[PDB]
Amino acid sequence: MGKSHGYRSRTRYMFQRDFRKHGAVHLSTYLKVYKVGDIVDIKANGSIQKGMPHKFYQGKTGVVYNVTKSSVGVIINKMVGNRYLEKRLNLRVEHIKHSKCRQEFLERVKANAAKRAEAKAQGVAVQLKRQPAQPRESRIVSTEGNVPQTLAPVPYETFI
Amino acid sequence: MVNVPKTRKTYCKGKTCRKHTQHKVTQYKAGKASLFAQGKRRYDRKQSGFGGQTKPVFHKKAKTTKKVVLRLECVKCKTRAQLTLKRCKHFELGGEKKQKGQALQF
Amino acid sequence: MARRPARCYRYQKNKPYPKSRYNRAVPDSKIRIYDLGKKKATVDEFPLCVHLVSNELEQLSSEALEAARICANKYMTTVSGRDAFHLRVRVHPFHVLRINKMLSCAGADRLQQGMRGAWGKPHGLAARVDIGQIIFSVRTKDSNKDVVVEGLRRARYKFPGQQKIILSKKWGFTNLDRPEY
RNA sequence: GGUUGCGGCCAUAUCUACCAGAAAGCACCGUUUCCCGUCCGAUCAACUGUGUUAAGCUGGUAGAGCCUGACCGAGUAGUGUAUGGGUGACCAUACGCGAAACUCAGGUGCUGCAAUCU
RNA sequence: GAAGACAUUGUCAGGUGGGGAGUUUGGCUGGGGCGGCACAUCUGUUAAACGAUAACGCAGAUGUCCUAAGGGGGGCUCAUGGAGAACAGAAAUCUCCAGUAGAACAAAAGGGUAAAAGCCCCCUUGAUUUUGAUUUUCAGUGUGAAUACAAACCAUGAAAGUGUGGCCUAUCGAUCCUUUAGUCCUCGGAAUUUGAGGCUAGAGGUGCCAGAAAAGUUACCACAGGGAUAACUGGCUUGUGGCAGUCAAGCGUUCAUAGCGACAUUGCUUUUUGAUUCUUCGAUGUCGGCUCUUCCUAUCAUACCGAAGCAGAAUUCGGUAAGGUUGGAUUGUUCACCCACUAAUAGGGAACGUGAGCUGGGUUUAGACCGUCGUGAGACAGGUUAGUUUUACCCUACUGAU
RNA sequence: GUGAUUUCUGCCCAGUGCUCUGAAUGUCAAAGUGAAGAAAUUCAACCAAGCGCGGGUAAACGGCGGGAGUAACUAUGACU
RNA sequence: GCCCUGAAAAUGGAUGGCGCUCAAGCGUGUUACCUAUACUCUACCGUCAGGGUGCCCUGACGAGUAGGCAGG
RNA sequence: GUCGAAUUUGGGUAUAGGGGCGAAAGACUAAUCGAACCAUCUAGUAGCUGGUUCCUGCCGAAGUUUCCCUCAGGAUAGCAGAAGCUCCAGUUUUAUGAGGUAAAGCGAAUGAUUAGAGGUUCCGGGGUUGACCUAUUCUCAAACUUUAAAUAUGUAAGAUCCUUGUUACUUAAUUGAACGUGGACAUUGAAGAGCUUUUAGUGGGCCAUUUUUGGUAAGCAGAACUGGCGAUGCGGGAUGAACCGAACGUAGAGUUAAGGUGCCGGAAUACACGCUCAUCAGACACCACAAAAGGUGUUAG
RNA sequence: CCUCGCAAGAGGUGCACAAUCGACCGAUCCUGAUGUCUUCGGAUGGAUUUGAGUAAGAGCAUAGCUGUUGGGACCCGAAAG
RNA sequence: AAAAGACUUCA
RNA sequence: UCCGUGAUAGUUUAAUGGUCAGAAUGGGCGCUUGUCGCGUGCCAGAUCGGGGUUCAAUUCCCCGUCGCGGAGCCA
């Protein structure tokens, strides 16, 4: 047929930054290193030239699975088809930004978590939630078997 | 096409040198005769008529351009290494040559 | 000109199109001028301002725009003379019209191939005139109110989108507009 | 009252009148023989002080620029959702949402570490 | 008799070789050709999308150029418009100020960046070899591409680092065989040489670009099928084409409207033309004409009427209104031209009414000629002469009879 | 090949076709002589008819044009 | 709004028909009726939950071409 | 038409299949000729048309994407099913970035109108001033492609901790984390559901709704998002694949939807009122037409 | 399962299974000891891609059946050579 | 044994 | 009407590598020659209109205007 398919096409709104974001990015962002299990958005800065993902991946959130030299390895899930696999993306730190939402989420659950401990000692807020969590569980916890369980619905039978 | 000079220093792939050393760069045309080739099959297939599979190659498509056609030959060890794909016409050599600058005039 | 009623043009066709790269050799703007009468005059002498406003959402032809506006102008300049009051056209004509231009009989149909096929060869300009939009904004003196109204009536039978004459308010009226000095 | 190292948020810090870090917490000027820049000590690369607050950094003070809000415009333009009306095109209706100007306001920066002061 | 190591025969080599033979002879595509590119592949919009998204959709590029147009670092900051300088206009030039991405960045597009990735000066070769996690390819499918390494090796650089080709988003070739490269394996008693086979890699054509060795004609035709697709009839639409309405610029001596009437504009019809691809390719008989019927109203005449620029009077325009509308010449013609007639010699439909009625002149088979084109076969919406008309009515429909 | 007669049948050998002489110069096969050589394999003396390189050839297929300017009126254009 | 005017077509009249017009029109409110295989329920056949002893029971779901499988 | 000659013809008789035979039409070679016929190879092969024969149950389609001498087909995912294995899915809310399209900014800019007002450059007349053309600059009517803030709206991915020891690690004999282990401690939803083998019909769709893109338009072309038809009965709508109601084992009773109640035709010639008198008119959608112009002293506001 | 407490449940102890990890045996690719010392045969160790081995250990045989290629290949249909 | 053309005026 | 193909001084036509434009004729200029003319010396372009790219455009794109060839099917 006709025309291309193509990485660069349809980027004009996404690639481009605001009047305020315009100008060289700040090397602090370039410098930043992250740990595994951190939650990071991927959306490329227009003002960096290289390290850029496929354009089609921007606005997705992933977890830093591992790092191998300057660029980092991100797990994200795409969509549509049969037995879709989760993807690894090599995407630079300039393009990767923290996510506040889990950080404040983590503080709140943990801040809460202290309030409870005192209640577990001397206090009864609950009671029903208390019953599963002592009987429940190891995993250790923290494992790669839970990932295929999540992986399996992402290829959705109905949508198809 | 492009000036690359014939005598250069670059890395030699071979285990004997393993360092940057002098190479001579050259195009490599065609060679056969031995007959223990495609040529053998042809002799056999052309008797009477056909030839069959020899028949391919030509008539022409045409094209315009080739890609790069090189040996880089060490003169320390006289071992060599080949190069990876690049687009070239043609190629410009001379046993030296610049493309220099300069000036003025021209 | 060449017939097609305005059955072809009036309903709101097309992702616009009139973009400057994408159309060398459009046929002209035929509108003679946009402001008329006393061009050398501010708005503020005139105590009366009359407007003509749309009921429908349309594309008006360039020829209809000039024909309506000249018909109004002949009524104004005959009754109020040459150095009359002052008129402004609200809507200029810049939406570009494609139509395919008269085949052949060669059994050559479209000779193209079979076809048609974008890149249609331009037929001229139109103006978007959407619901409640104002085609003419005319500034006058109350002892010639009647004259502008018949000029606006003689304008209406020269575009197809149904429109209404109206007396304006904007900012102010014309005299809450004036007290600061 | 904080000058300044190193930064971060990076249009609340772009631009154009004029007051201030300063008798031993600056900039300048002077040695520009020279490592050093050359095409000129200008650039720069270096060694230093008559002293001077004029610029410099930055602090003091005023407008166009701009973010942020209040005020109408007042839920207006537009909008997914379910549907009535219109000759057509087109419109409305309930269900959830909601931009443009206007004028007024805040700010001619913020924040953190240290060289840490008369 | 002639002749004689020739010639002729046997065999082979080169050249010619549609006589003959086997074959192929490009896809998309608002019919297939023709024309072209939308055969590979990138863009800016389409695109409502995270991703994936069509049309021969819009606009628009790539099949190169490059050892500097790579690398790195130090050092500088633009395009520019004003001013300033005899001459100089193109006038560089140089100078000063003001100058944030409007410049530069080889090349589309768009994006993107100010001690920069830009500009300059030096120094240099990492445009190295090896392996490539992964994405794009493509959601699993290759080449290719890219983003990251680690080993191997160097550069510049103060060094950290950077540097896995080209401002950024990424810039293309499988497969035999060949070539070449590596150090090494290998070819059947032993033993010695040659040249084979092969390991991993690079290069040599395939742009019919995830890959064939490759031209037409058929009107002498043939076959399988298709209304998945044309000519057609019907239908849809109605640009066109016919006709009407509104408005009324204007002209009519003066006077919009006796009459004529532009621009513009809304309609209506389905009877020209196009458009489509719904219907029919186990078959709808073509145009035209004849003749027989029934109809329509947008009425040409007749009847009744209105207006007039109606004196009469020929008349002009218009309303109501569907109860006749010649015969001929040319042409196959429809159409039309043209002649005398007439009251006037209207237009339209009924499968362009009408082939189980006729006709058969044209279109439109098979033979032939000419112009033109084609090497040729043979072709033209080029012209021309000749060139076929099957069926015994079951049902229905109805003239008539019972 | 053309088409009784009768008057006549003009120009064009560039392409294509065909052909002519080629005792001498660039291309042109094999066996074949030579060179390296254990073999062969590479290469090189030597050329036929053919390409070239030159003449003939249309009652051989066929072919027989392109813009201007210009009359002591204008139109045409003998002529440049 | 209504309505006429704009408003012309071909074998024969219709809004499905007759065709009523303080409606059998059209709009505004409103009362009562009618009406599916729907929904509910009764009985019961398959599947699956299951239970229980070659057999019995509970409740849910349950059109079907291409087509797969399984019992007859 | 020919008919005394290239005439006519009888017998005997020559020439046989890319061959014969031709005053050459591709005519003719025993009803067969752009290549006889007979038999064989043959049960050629045909992405092509047609057909393929008993019941039942549970589930139940696809007409899409890449490749392909490929588009009337293959191929491979895409969409279904069985047979078993093993015991988690969703959603507001939070946070992110993003469609868009209206009025500013940049770039383009038709394109007016334009006052005020500095400066071009020419000549040309008069008493430095001061007529004459271009043109900054603050400054004004709407369009279009970027961008703010978009407003929107669908989206649209995303929802354990500690201590102890021991090991590693990249990075000055230098500073640190973060790795891995070993051990102990303490924490609105509901079967919508994981994996495997093998299997089939495509690999030609259609309509509507919404958002479109081309096309005058179209019972058009070509996308997106979704439902239906295909493969879905039954009830409504005159008829009528995709309009409404409705998803259907059997059978019955009840009551309803959609939609209807003068008659045909269940069921009202219902009730309160108002307009209309043209037979308007008995009409959601629909081959349901009716406009510009709309008169208008029709009625009403 | 047991140790339990018992209509819950954890901690031990043993592991199918699947996911995750390492580790080895050959192939490559690279240092190559011990060394013999004409010659060169080969421990160690690592990186790699692939293939193999252990908790990823098992068939073969016939059977009735499905699919696939085939042979005419479900059946017929053509002009054909 | 020859390069070379026109011609155009006043009883 | 599509696809092909062009255009340069008064006129016909050569030409380029992005930096440079010609010829021939026709004319205007003398001298020849009784006098004109032939001859013989001398002379002189907005490269069709158009916008764009670049350092630099006659030269490279894009469009029109005109003059040309080539198509034209089954009705």
* Separation of C3 CA and E301 C1' (Å): 35
**Strand H nucleotides below 7 A of a protein CB?**
77-80, 88-90, 94-100, 105, 108-115, 141-149, 156-161, 178-180, 186-187, 192-196, 212-217, 292-294
Helix (H, G, I), strand (E, B), or coil: what is residue A81?
coil
Q: Output the CA angle A19-A20-A24, nearest 5 degrees.
A: 95
Resolution for this PDB entry, in angstroms: 8.8
Residue B21 tokens, joined: 């050393």
Nearest residue: Cα versus C1' of E69: B2
Strand partners of residue C97: C124
CB A43 within 8 A of CB A97: yes
Q: DSSP of A93-137, one letter per residue? A: TTSEEE-HHHHHHHHHHHHHHHHHHHHHHS--S-STTHHHHTT--
CB C68 within 8 A of CB C163: no
Identify the helix (H) or strand (E) that includes residue C140: strand C134-140
Q: What is the largest CA-CA distance in chain A?
A: 74
Closest CA to B77 of B36, B35, B40, B23: B23
User: CA–CA distance from C27 to each of A121, B64, C95, C118, C137 (Å)?
Assistant: 87, 43, 11, 18, 27
CB A57 within 8 A of CB A77: no
At A74, give phi and psi (nearest 5°): -120, 140
Taking the CA atoms of C63, C65, C71 and C74 in sequence, report the sign of the dihedral they define.
negative
Is the C-beta atom of A136 closer than 7 angstroms to strand I? yes
The rounded distance, in Å, linking the Cα atoms of C6 and C160 is 8
First to last CA, chain C: 53
The CA-based dihedral angle spanning residues A143, A149, A153, A157, taken in that order and rounded to the nearest 10 degrees: 150
* Separation of A160 CA and G59 C1' (Å): 34
At A110, give phi and psi (nearest 5°): -60, -45
Is the C-beta atom of C100 closer than 7 angstroms to strand K? no
Residue A22 tokens, joined: 């315009």
The rounded distance, in Å, linking the Cα atoms of B8 and B96 is 9
Residue A43 tokens, joined: 């959306």
CB A157 within 8 A of CB A80: no
CB C62 within 8 A of CB C125: yes
The rounded distance, in Å, linking the Cα atoms of C73 and C115 is 45
The rounded distance, in Å, linking the Cα atoms of B87 and C112 is 39
How would you label A12-30 residue by residue, b for 16+ Cβ within 10 Å and e otherwise? Answer: eeeeeeeeeeeeeeeeeee
The rounded distance, in Å, linking the Cα atoms of B25 and B75 is 11
Upper half-sphere CA count for residue C109 (Cβ side, 13 Å): 6
Residues contacting B68, CB < 8 A, separation 6+? B83, B85, B86, B87, B88, B91
Residues contacting C41, CB < 8 A, separation 6+? C86
Closest CA to C147 of C58, C88, C78: C78
Residues contacting A91, CB < 8 A, separation 6+? A42, A51, A53, A57, A71, A72, A74
* Separation of C129 CA and H212 C1' (Å): 21
Strand partners of residue A113: none
The rounded distance, in Å, linking the Cα atoms of C96 and C22 is 10
Q: DSSP of B73-88, one letter per residue? A: EESSSS-EEE------
- With 0-12 CB in 10 A as exposed, 13-18 as middle and 19+ as buried, what is B105? exposed
At A90, give phi and psi (nearest 5°): -95, 115
Closest CA to B25 of B99, B93, B101: B93
The CA R_g of chain A, rounded to the nearest whole Å, is 21
State the angle between helix axes of C145-156 and C62-79 in degrees (0 to 180), rounded to the nearest 10. Answer: 150
Is the C-beta atom of A82 closer than 7 angstroms to strand I? no
User: CA–CA distance from C31 to each of B65, C18, C92, C127, C136 (Å)?
Assistant: 56, 17, 8, 11, 13
